[PDB]
Design a binder for these strands. Structure first.
Ligand code: MG
Ligand code: MG
Ligand code: MG
Ligand code: MG
Ligand code: MG
Lengths: 133, 218, 257, 123
RNA sequence: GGCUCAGUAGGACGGCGAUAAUCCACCCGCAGCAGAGACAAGGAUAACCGCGGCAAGCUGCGGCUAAGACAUGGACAGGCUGCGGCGCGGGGAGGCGCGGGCAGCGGACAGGGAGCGGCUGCGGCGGAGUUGCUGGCCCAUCAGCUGGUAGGUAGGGUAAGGGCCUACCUAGGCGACGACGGGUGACGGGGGGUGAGAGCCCGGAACCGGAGAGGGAGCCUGAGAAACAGCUCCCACGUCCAAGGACGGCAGCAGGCGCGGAACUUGCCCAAUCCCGGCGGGGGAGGCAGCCACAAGACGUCGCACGGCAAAGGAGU
């Protein structure tokens, strides 16, 4: 199961579960408020903060449970040819368990710059929009 | 091999050039060992030495506590015996010798612990003076039995003219005194004490004025 | 390289100091005192390039040795002391009191002020923080700090502090309609009234300013120094009064309209 | 014919800094002293600056109030121009380097170092 | 600071950020600094006085003696850690600041008759470490690459987030939108050249950033170095020795040799520009002059006095 007893932060100020508002005009998901998961890397019920760039990308890979690969496709303009280039970069983004099942491959996901969560993880999923919507 | 011998209580010191057959009697001994002068010669009967240091025919020191007789290369910090550290935190690897005496040693440093029967004219007859009288006042008042009230640098110059034998020219020694209660010391403490309480009431005044002006009910 | 930079090149010097290219290789590196390096000038520039009391460093050393210079009521016998915006340089010899302030040419200028205007200065607050034991002491942008101020004083406000007294005697808030001075930017050294404040959650509040002439510009609120409310100016204004006349207006005065 | 371009008073340095344009179509400080109530010693001219064609030399000269503030404030070479003090010898730059660089390697006092040196030289 | 551009194809640089993940010297502004016998502070050591060793470099023995050195004395606070925990302020976002709690630690003036100087904390300033996004050469006769690799949990470690490391566990991660590998006689940039322009080419070279000090690696001291006109060792070159040992790192300034097509005086000086030092000092940074048709610009076809200069010389009469 778990190596340590699962424990959250003491909630300063559902008053038995710790959850914070990340700011920047965003909302806490109700799966994060009414949830039992103890992910410390989660932006809402965990020990990370959102500061810096917030971009919106598309989910490329949902493999490897807590991380996801988010591709941000952009255009770069070659001044000599006066045409654009389709470019992209893939980001290893932390997917909190409050978005489990909600986020699937193809959804447009807004990611916010956290700490250096892993070796290649500096972003966390703070919200999402379904592809069908 | 010479023998650098000093007397601590007399402050006298001279080199004793012992012969070669004496030197082989001193081999295998180390620093801190106490040798009887009968080992050295008949002219030192009844003396007690203590081997303090030594040197080399290559000029090295003899480091205390190495327990070899060979030349060893050792890495020394500041304050380590055998290295005069000049710049701050600079460690060097110096060559020293281990404490065991051998044939390589040019001179052996030792001190007289116990005076023997026959005197040594450079070493026993003479008395060489302590080079410096103390600067600290507590160390000076015990040394001369100075009155606690009296001026210290005045009281010694009283004593020099008392025990002078019709000397027309008397140069005085270097007399500076440190660590003494002086009016500059007492003035600084009382000023610092009265300012400490003056700060406390002034800070407490500005807290009351802040609590009067901007929080007038409470 | 890496570490505390002891030297400063002449080309790398701030252009507000108005140092020439061919003066030398080095410029006087300021000491690390009250103002930031981007918003300060040393004393040794003012006493040779502005006031011209000393032409030589030997003369300049003598002036600071005999302690005639005094800035913000403290003697400050340092060659490279960073004097910044709103600070008052008061010399008892010559009885000259000046307040350091910007010009329309985007340079530091020493503006001669009265002996009574030299008794105070204005300081923009940086932050507001409760100290140990509950002392609510605020901190100004020039590194000064004062305790037990008005609780209404929050960030970006300017306070009128006495010089000869360490207290803060006057408070000026950061709202719309206040006379502002633009400390850094393209509009450096412009005086105007704040029209609108745009907040921009996350970073960089933007202030919209129209001047006395009517020219409108936008700046960051961190580059906004309040110098008066709607009725009054709290300081004297320098020569030119912060109008920043346009290049065509400079053209039209030479040749007619 | 001498004329003063601008007259400025340096009250902190106890002097008057004045700029004069002297003209000679087809020794200097003497007639400048015969303009103001000052001795010849109180007259220090910084530099003579002339345009190419005209005979209109510009002088920037200083008017001190005492000989002691003059030799204190002004640089040491200009008092060598007036009077030739040479109060500090300062032997030569190449001599002072070698004189200091020998003193740096000497630990302790010089007398302990020179005694140990010649004692080894005697042997 | 100065020099240099080997390495570096992103550990760089530039632009925009982040540090709510961090540390700190000078300096500036604030608060403060233990009543302890206190009209008071303990043992040392260098200098020095002698005696020496040793070719030299360097070093020993003895004797005394200082402090703003090193201690003792003495805890109101800050601080650290665990647990508890309401609020009041700030911030986009919080136990971030502060007040209120219980414990376990721990911890700021015994200085001076030329101005003061110490130490603790908060806030700057001055720095610094990490870091996100993004842009920038060539080769596909380089097409698949990856094993600490990608992630999770937990601990360690760090000033500090992190596979940074370890333990266990997932099977990931990147790629024709060019990964990976290679090449570069590649430091990047501000910029420069050239063209009407689109472009092409260059950027060693003033300023900024990086990196290096013969090749390396390791470290001490310190706020800051993995420092090199610091140390320790190895390697490659080189030097001195009395043969036991001792040293050298001019990609600092001149100068020499070598290399080549290819690049100056072993000059003078802190006067200017500035820096270190709490001032008198030091500065081959730097300036001045000399050398060179290397370049830009202007103009033709010999000696006093003056003038300036740190000094000299030149400009100018
Ligand atoms: Mg000794
Ligand atoms: Mg001793
Ligand atoms: Mg290269
Ligand atoms: Mg370059
Ligand atoms: Mg550089």
């Amino acid at each position: 199961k778990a190596k340590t007893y699962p424990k959250q932060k003491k909630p300063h100020l559902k008053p038995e579960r710790y959850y914070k508002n990340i700011g920047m005009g965003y909302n806490v998901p109700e799966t994060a408020i009414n949830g039992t998961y103890i992910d410390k890397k989660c932006p809402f019920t965990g020990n990370v903060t959102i500061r810096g760039r917030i971009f919106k990308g598309e989910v490329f890979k949902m493999k490897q449970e807590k991380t996801i690969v988010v591709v941000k496709r952009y255009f770069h303009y070659n001044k000599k040819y006066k045409r654009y280039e389709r470019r992209n970069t893939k980001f290893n983004v932390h997917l909190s368990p409050c978005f489990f099942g909600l986020v699937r491959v193809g959804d447009t996901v807004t990611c916010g710059e956290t700490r250096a969560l892993s070796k290649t993880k500096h972003f966390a999923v703070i919200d999402y929009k379904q592809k069908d919507s | 091999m010479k023998l650098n011998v000093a007397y601590p209580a007399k402050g006298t010191q001279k080199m004793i050039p012992i012969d070669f057959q004496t030197s082989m009697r001193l081999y295998g001994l180390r620093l801190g060992a106490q040798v009887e002068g009968e080992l050295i010669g008949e002219d030192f009967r009844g003396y007690v030495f203590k081997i303090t240091g030594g040197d080399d025919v290559s000029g090295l020191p003899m480091k205390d506590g190495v327990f070899t007789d060979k030349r060893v290369r050792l890495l020394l910090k500041k304050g380590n015996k055998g290295y005069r550290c000049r710049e701050k935190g600079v460690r060097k690897r110096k060559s020293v010798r281990g404490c065991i005496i051998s044939g390589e040693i040019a001179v052996v440093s030792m001190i007289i612990l116990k005076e023997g029967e026959k005197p040594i004219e450079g070493l026993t007859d003479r008395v060489v003076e302590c080079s410096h009288l103390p600067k600290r006042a507590s160390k000076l008042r015990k040394l001369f039995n100075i009155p606690k009230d009296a001026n210290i640098v005045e009281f010694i110059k009283e004593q020099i003219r008392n025990n002078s034998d019709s000397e027309k020219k008397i140069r005085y020694p270097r007399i500076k005194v440190t660590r003494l209660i002086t009016p500059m010391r007492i003035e600084r403490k009382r000023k610092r004490l009265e300012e400490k309480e003056a700060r406390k009431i002034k800070s407490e005044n500005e807290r009351k004025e802040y609590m009067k002006k901007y929080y007038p009910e409470k | 390289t890496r570490g505390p930079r002891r030297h400063l090149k002449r080309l790398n010097a701030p252009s507000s100091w108005q140092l020439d290219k061919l003066g030398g290789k080095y410029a006087p590196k300021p000491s690390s005192g009250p103002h930031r390096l981007s918003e300060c000038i040393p004393l040794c520039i003012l006493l040779t390039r502005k006031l011209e009391y000393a032409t030589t460093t030997k003369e300049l050393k003598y002036i600071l040795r005999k302690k005639m210079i005094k800035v913000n009521g403290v003697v400050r016998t340092d060659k490279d002391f960073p004097v910044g915006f709103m600070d008052v340089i008061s010399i008892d010899t010559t009885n000259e009191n000046m307040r350091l302030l910007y010009s329309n040419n985007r340079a530091f200028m020493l503006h001669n002020i009265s002996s009574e205007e030299a008794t105070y200065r204005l300081c923009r607050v940086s932050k507001k923080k409760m100290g140990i034991g509950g002392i609510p002491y605020i901190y100004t942008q020039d590194g000064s700090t004062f305790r037990y101020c008005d609780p209404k004083i929050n960030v970006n406000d300017v306070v009128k502090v006495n010089i000869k007294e360490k207290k803060v005697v006057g408070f000026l808030p950061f709202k719309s309609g206040m006379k502002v001075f633009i400390t850094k930017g393209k509009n450096l050294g412009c005086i105007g009234v704040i029209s609108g404040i745009e907040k921009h959650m996350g970073s960089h509040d933007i202030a919209y300013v129209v001047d006395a002439k009517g020219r409108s510009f936008s700046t960051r609120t961190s580059n906004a120094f309040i110098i008066g409310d709607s009725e009054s100016y709290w300081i004297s204004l320098p020569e030119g009064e912060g109008i920043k006349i346009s290049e065509l207006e400079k053209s039209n005065i030479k040749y007619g309209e | 014919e001498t004329q003063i371009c601008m007259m400025r008073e340096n009250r902190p340095l106890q002097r008057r800094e004045v700029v004069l344009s002297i003209s000679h179509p087809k020794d200097i400080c003497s007639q400048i002293s015969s303009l103001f109530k000052v001795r010849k010693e109180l007259i220090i001219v910084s530099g003579c600056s002339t345009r190419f064609g005209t005979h209109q030399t510009k002088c920037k000269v200083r008017i001190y109030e005492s000989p002691e503030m003059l030799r204190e404030i002004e640089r040491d070479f200009v008092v060598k121009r007036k009077t030739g003090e040479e109060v500090r010898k300062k032997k030569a730059r190449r001599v002072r380097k070698k004189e200091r660089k020998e003193k740096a390697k000497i630990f302790g006092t010089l007398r302990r170092h020179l005694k140990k040196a010649e004692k080894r030289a005697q042997k």
